[PDB]
Swiss-Prot record, chain B:
Active-site residues, as the UniProt record annotates them: D22
Localization per record: Cytoplasm; Cell membrane
Protein's name according to its UniProt entry: DNA damage-inducible protein 1
Transmembrane regions: none
Miscellaneous remark of the record: Present with 6510 molecules/cell in log phase SD medium.
Inducing stimuli: By DNA damage via PDR3.
Subunit and interaction comment: Forms homodimers. Interacts with RAD23. These interactions are mediated by the UBA domain. Is also able to bind ubiquitin and polyubiquitinated proteins. Interacts with the SNAREs SNC1, SNC2, SSO1, TLG1 and TLG2. Binding to SSO1 is promoted by the phosphorylation of 'Ser-49' of SSO1 by TKP1.
Per UniProt, location of the Glycyl lysine isopeptide (Lys-Gly) (interchain with G-Cter in ubiquitin) cross-link in this chain: K47
The entry's keywords: Aspartyl protease, Cell membrane, Cytoplasm, Hydrolase, Isopeptide bond, Membrane, Protease, Protein transport, Transport, Ubl conjugation
UniProt record, GO biological process: positive regulation of DNA replication; protein secretion; protein transport to vacuole involved in ubiquitin-dependent protein catabolic process via the multivesicular body sorting pathway; ubiquitin-dependent protein catabolic process; vesicle-mediated transport
Primary localisation category: cytoplasm
Covered residues, full protein: 199 to 325 of 428
Flavoprotein as UniProt keyword: no
Family membership noted in the UniProt record: Belongs to the DDI1 family.
Amino acid sequence: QVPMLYINIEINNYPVKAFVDTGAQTTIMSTRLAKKTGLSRMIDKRFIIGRIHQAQVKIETQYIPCSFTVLDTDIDVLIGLDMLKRHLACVDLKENVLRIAEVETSFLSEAEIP
Amino acid sequence: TQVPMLYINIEINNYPVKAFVDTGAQTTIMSTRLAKKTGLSRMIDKKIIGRIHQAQVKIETQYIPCSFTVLDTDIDVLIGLDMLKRHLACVDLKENVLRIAEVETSFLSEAEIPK
């Protein structure tokens, strides 16, 4: 009960379903997604497995600089409060749509949810 | 590079409460401590944990029905996606305000945040 919040995003052209978590301190990308997208080579292991500082995430028709902390997990991408605030977003549950940057994308349906 | 989490003021059986707004949480939670203090623990549908089906939560000037899962935790009230969807809210990070039910309230500053 209670379908979680997800949005569609593209990283290096790879389509991804991202979980929107306001209770999370930082945005995260899975090691395997970093691999698949080729972002593995840009992982700053300056010490969790490393951090990708300003990758270009695509949401709708806009590329936005998002920072990810790479972790070995089943969740490919977790949009945290840190990134939610940076791009002054609005989690509109009434309109069931996410508004981030200068764009506005919808929340995946129960089915389209991973 | 820290960021203050999302909290808002609410009242439960008249007691002021700093509540955490977590879209990552499926279920809204109320601590055993708060439940016992406010007395809502007597409505708990079950070591005082269980389920509160209906409770009037005051946000700004409106009283709205909410359900809680009472667990022994530190956070006194964690508002989950379940209640954020039930009351068709909007987590406006541009204005640092929460629009829920037929009301609008702002988030607490790092100073107001519980610790």
